[PDB]
Amino acid sequence: IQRTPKIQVYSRHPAENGKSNFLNCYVSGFHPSDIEVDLLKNGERIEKVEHSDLSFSKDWSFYLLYYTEFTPTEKDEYACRVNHVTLSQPKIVKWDRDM
Amino acid sequence: EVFNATRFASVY
Amino acid sequence: GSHSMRYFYTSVSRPGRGEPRFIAVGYVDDTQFVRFDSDAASQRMEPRAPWIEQEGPEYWDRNTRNVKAHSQTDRANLGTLRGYYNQSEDGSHTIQRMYGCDVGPDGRFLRGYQQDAYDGKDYIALNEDLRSWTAADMAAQITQRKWETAHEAEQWRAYLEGRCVEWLRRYLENGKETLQRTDAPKTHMTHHAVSDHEATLRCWALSFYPAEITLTWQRDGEDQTQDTELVETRPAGDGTFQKWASVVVPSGQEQRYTCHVQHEGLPKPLTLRW
């Protein structure tokens, strides 16, 4: 009836600085379906971000993939900001190149 | 291929 | 191997916000191939995989008409259920429906499915014999009696054993090059020190299809779950999947740990060791 999202932020391929890639934020395990997911670059919301069509698993929990093409650098920090009714403040998960 | 219902199928 | 086709429908009432939103998605195995969004401009069922685009215009007209009809019924059903549960006009509520069929490797029917949820809990579901229903509560019992009277199970059994599997077989043929592939995981291990006393080993599986996989850690050949972490399998965004499993180990004992990878695309399971 109310389930808080699981959040993973990750790249499509292992990051190599200067090489084109995709930044993903996968939210799953949540209910109800109303949710906002934003990708952040150095704390700033990335403008062009796409997402998958709403679907759900066997247990009725919803899941969505948000993604944008990007080129990692040494300097830039990325994160995913998730806004959901179960969260008193949006949850911000930083991108770690090895998770 | 989606389910092909009668007009009045699946009403609760 | 075996294959499946599934449709997933979500209707959400948006009180004050206007009319309910309906979203439908279709899958073969772990590959999405169609979508319909009641809020989108096209008002059509839309392709989401390359092999479904070889269906002709009649297919898209028919699937658009029928999925729209389903969306209209679920709109009706949101009002009906709020009455059944004596709920106010104020809150938002959710109907979810899943249905589909499985076939075996020779293409023959294996089983069929239809199940509905209201606000995230089971409401009514077709039983495996495709002839009777399981109602989760008194409200659902009202629906059960209407559907038993209308012989609705006959329509579902006819679709699940007929058109469902026939079209699933057709998709597997039309999309053989991608749906009938196995992409074996590309695997590697990482190693990072917490302190002088401990390190983390992380065992990775990337670029694999289908999504089903098992990653297990062993220490000295015995399965280990303590001080491990396994993340949920996640999409890479290109049609393949990713997963990792980590373990915290005492520094200098790395050689005692093995990560074991099982996947349909591997003739034999893999063992990785740092």
Numbering used by the authors:
A (entry chain B): 1 to 99
B (entry chain C): 1 to 12
C (entry chain A): 1 to 274
Authors' description from the paper:
MHC, also known as HLA in humans, plays a crucial role in orchestrating the immune system recognition and response to viral pathogens. Similar to HLA-A*0101, which is one of the earliest identified HLA alleles among the human population, HLA-A*2601 possesses a similar characteristic for the binding peptide and acts as a prevalent allomorph in HLA-I. In this study, we found that, compared with HLA-A*0101, HLA-A*2601 individuals exhibit distinctive features for the T cell responses to SARS-CoV-2 and influenza virus after infection and/or vaccination. Furthermore, we determined the crystal structures of the HLA-A*2601 complexed to four peptides derived from SARS-CoV-2 and human papillomavirus, with one structure of HLA-A*0101 for comparison. The overall structure of HLA-A*2601 displays the common characteristics of classic HLA-I molecules, with the extracellular region of the H chain folding into three domains.
To fully understand the specific features of peptide presentation by HLA-A*2601, we determined the four crystal structures of HLA-A*2601 complexed to SARS-CoV-2 T cell epitope peptides EVF and CVA and two peptides from HPV: DVM and YVA. For the peptides from SARS-CoV-2, EVF is a 12mer peptide with negative-charged residue E in P1 position, and it stimulates higher IFN-γ production in HLA-A*2601. Moreover, this peptide exhibits a positivity rate of 85.7% (6 of 7) within the HLA-A*2601 population. In the structure of the 12-mer EVF peptide presented by HLA-A*2601, with P2 and PΩ serving as anchor residues, whereas P5 to P9 protrude from the HLA, forming a loop available for TCR recognition. For EVF, when the original P1E mutated to oppositely charged R, it was observed that the peak intensity of in vitro refolding complexes of HLA-A*2601 decreased. When the P1E of EVF mutated to A, it led to a minor reduction. At position 62, the unique residue Arg in HLA-A*2601, along with Arg163, forms a salt bridge network with P1, thereby stabilizing P1 of the peptide. When P1 is D or E it leads to the pulling of Arg62 and Arg163 toward P1, resulting in the “close” conformation of pocket A. At this point, P1 is firmly anchored within pocket A. As one the allomorph-specific residues, Arg62 can form a tight hydrogen bond network with the either D or E of P1 of the binding peptides in the assistance of Arg163. In the structures of HLA-A*2601 complexed to EVF, CVA, and YVA, the PΩ position is occupied by Tyr, forming hydrogen bonds with residues Asn77, Tyr84, and Lys146 in the HLA.
